[PDB]
Amino acid sequence: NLAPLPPHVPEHLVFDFDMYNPSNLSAGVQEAWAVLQESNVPDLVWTRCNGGHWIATRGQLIREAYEDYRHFSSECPFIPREAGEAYDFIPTSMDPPEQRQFRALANQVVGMPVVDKLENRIQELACSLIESLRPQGQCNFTEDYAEPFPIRIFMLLAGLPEEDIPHLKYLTDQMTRPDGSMTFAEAKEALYDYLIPIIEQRRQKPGTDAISIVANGQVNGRPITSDEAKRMCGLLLVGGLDTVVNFLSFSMEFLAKSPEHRQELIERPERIPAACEELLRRFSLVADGRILTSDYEFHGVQLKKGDQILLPQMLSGLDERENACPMHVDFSRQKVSHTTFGHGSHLCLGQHLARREIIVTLKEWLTRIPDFSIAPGAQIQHKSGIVSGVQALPLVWDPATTKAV
Ligand code: HEM
Ligand SMILES: CCCCCC[C@](O)(Cn1ccnc1)c1ccc(Cl)cc1Cl
């Protein structure tokens, strides 16, 4: 379903990429998107899919656009437009200077000092989860670890009941990898129906949880509104539930297929951090965008006010001009260049948490289960969207090769 080309789009700049169902999805999601970086593709293309929008294909353009909030506004960050339109998450749907006050608050909740405080639980849960899987010689990494691990830590931070997971997770999935079962606004409202009562509760009777801190915070010397707390918490929920969850699956799928990379980490643990950066570059998984505030000429292409542009954070680090042999995983790269956590004023506040969760997982999994593989005859399926995912990850191992701690 292609939309008619607007008058201003040169036909030579058309490249019909469907961010929700790219073409060689079979090969892998990162590989499917990387088609955009072939020699045949211009730097800046127009797709008629998902209602028509621009796509910046190169790290340099992605970064510039990200830096430039004057022209490229976060007002409508999602494609298709209805979704970008229905989303009013804070601080994501705002531009500086306004953004800064809200960010400062969100940072209170997810920041460095919080991860530091939470470190023992992260370690505790990882170890417990892994130890529990170990003797089985088989899981569903996606349902068995990648989900519960980050999720339960989030629930703990937010002080929300684990009983809510399935319901929340569904709503979250609808948002980043829409299915057709809902609509963007409908999904948004259901999450909002959830959040409202809880927030109200925490304004009256505060806790020490993230929601209590957000519901009761100060922004530009005055107290946040209920609507504003609702809107921040909505973001926090999606970040906590959807991201880390998908990332670990790509990383695990990779490790399951590359014995040599496993070994490297086993013998030279001093590389973990470096490896974690490399995997964040290679298995980058987020793609959102911006809205043009005005007619603007960008790298010779004429952009019209109100045009949306996809600035795929995923793409930067896959760009050959940025990383030699981009598709190759090399833990000893001199410089791992990516924008996996964004760029500009919208830089991921949750990056510290996410890094801690990854590093713990690698160290702890490899410690106990050094030797594993993908289950024979399993067909791993990736899914594309605002956040990309793995459908299921069936792993197998010989319990006799594991190590209890
Ligand atoms: C591997 C994991 C993650 C990745 C790749 C990731 C990626 C991103 C990206 C690309 C952005 C910027 C979007 C834009 O510019 O429109 C963003 C922002 C954000 N992230 Fe993350 N994120 C992850 C995990 C998390 C976690 C665990 C949380 C905390 C719940 C979270 C919270 C945030 C928030 C609050 C912002 C908005 C900052 C602002 O607008 O000032 N993220 N993230
Ligand atoms: C629609 C406005 C806010 C978007 C919701 C947050 C998130 O979906 C997940 N997330 C949140 C923090 N980290 C991951 C995301 C994913 C990718 C990109 Cl590019 C932006 C956003 Cl906001």
Q: Label residue 70 exposed, middle or buried (CB < 10 Å: 0-12, 13-18, 19+).
A: exposed
Residues 163-202 as b or e (16 or more Cβ within 10 Å = b): eebeebbebbbbbbbbeeebebeebbebbbebbeebbeeb
Ligand closest to Cα of 76 equals 2
Q: Is 241 a catalytic residue?
A: no
CA 286 to ligand 2 center in whole angstroms: 8
HSE of 243 in the Cβ direction (CA atoms, 13 Å)? 23
HSE of 115 in the Cβ direction (CA atoms, 13 Å)? 17
In units of Å, what resolution does this entry have? 1.6
Q: Is 156 a catalytic residue?
A: no
Distances 42 to 45, 159, 320 between C-alpha atoms, Å: 6, 48, 15
For 263-381, strand residue ranges (E) read 288-292, 296-298, 301-303, 308-311, 373-374
Rounded to 5°, angle at Cα 82 from 80 and 84: 70
Element (H, E) at 264: helix 259-267
Ligand closest to Cα of 98 equals 1
DSSP sequence for 170-225: HHHHHHHS--SSS-HHHHHHHHHHHHHHHHHHHHHS--SSHHHHHHT-EETTEEPP
Q: Is 281 a catalytic residue?
A: no
- The DSSP bridge partners found for residue 394 are 140
CA 270 to ligand 2 center in whole angstroms: 31
CB 309 within 8 A of CB 53: yes
DSSP label of 6: P
Nearest atom of ligand 2 to the alpha carbon of 313: 19
Q: What is the dihedral of CA 52, 58, 62, 68, to 10 degrees?
A: -100
The protein residue whose alpha carbon is closest to atom 13 in ligand 2 is 239
- The DSSP bridge partners found for residue 54 are 46, 309
| C-alpha–C-alpha distance, residues 42 and 14, integer Å | 9
Is residue 89 lining ligand 2, measured as CB closer than 6 Å?
Answer: yes
Q: Which of 23, 29, 19, 35 is nearest to 80 (CA)?
A: 19
CA 386 to ligand 2 center in whole angstroms: 8
The protein residue whose alpha carbon is closest to atom 18 in ligand 2 is 288
Ligand 2 probe mutation, 88, 171, 290, 386, most atoms within 8 A of CB: 386
Q: Which of 211, 208, 216, 202 is nearest to 233 (CA)?
A: 211
Distances 137 to 127, 260, 368, 387, 397 between C-alpha atoms, Å: 16, 21, 12, 30, 5
Rg (the chain; Cα; Å):
21
Residues 6+ apart with CB under 8 A from 229: 199, 203, 211, 214, 215, 217
Three-state DSSP at 327 gives coil
Q: Is 242 a catalytic residue?
A: yes
List residues near ligand 1 (CB under 6 A). Answer: 77, 91-92, 99, 103, 106, 110, 235-236, 239-240, 243-244, 247, 286, 288, 313, 340-342, 346, 348-350, 353-354
Q: Which of 66, 76, 43, 115 is nearest to 341 (CA)?
A: 66
CB 289 within 8 A of CB 310: yes
Ligand 1 probe mutation, 88, 175, 348, most atoms within 8 A of CB: 348
Is residue 84 lining ligand 2, measured as CB closer than 6 Å?
Answer: no
| C-alpha–C-alpha distance, residues 280 and 355, integer Å | 9
Domains and CATH numbers, the chain: 1-405 (1.10.630.10)
Residues 6+ apart with CB under 8 A from 188: 86, 87, 175, 234
Nearest atom of ligand 1 to the alpha carbon of 74: 16
Whether 348 has a binding-site annotation, put simply, is yes
DSSP sequence for 54-101: EEE-SHHHHHHHHH-TTTEETTS-SSSHHHHHH---TTTT--TTTHHH
CB 108 within 8 A of CB 217: yes
| C-alpha–C-alpha distance, residues 132 and 125, integer Å | 11
| C-alpha–C-alpha distance, residues 63 and 65, integer Å | 5
- The DSSP bridge partners found for residue 373 are 396
HSE of 332 in the Cβ direction (CA atoms, 13 Å)? 6
Nearest atom of ligand 2 to the alpha carbon of 234: 5
CA 373 to ligand 1 center in whole angstroms: 30
CA 350 to ligand 1 center in whole angstroms: 6
Residue type, 206: P
- The DSSP bridge partners found for residue 292 are 72
Residue type, 24: N
| C-alpha–C-alpha distance, residues 74 and 70, integer Å | 10
Experimental method reported for this structure: X-ray
Q: What is the dihedral of CA 177, 183, 185, 188, to 10 degrees?
A: -50
Residues 6+ apart with CB under 8 A from 365: 126, 130, 252
Rounded to 5°, angle at Cα 227 from 311 and 189: 70
| C-alpha–C-alpha distance, residues 143 and 149, integer Å | 10
CB 396 within 8 A of CB 137: yes
Residues 6+ apart with CB under 8 A from 334: none
| C-alpha–C-alpha distance, residues 121 and 130, integer Å | 14
Nearest atom of ligand 1 to the alpha carbon of 103: 41
Residue 184, both tokens: 């963007």
Q: Is 276 a catalytic residue?
A: no
| C-alpha–C-alpha distance, residues 345 and 336, integer Å | 21
Q: How far apart are the first and last CA of the chain?
A: 54
- The DSSP bridge partners found for residue 382 are 390
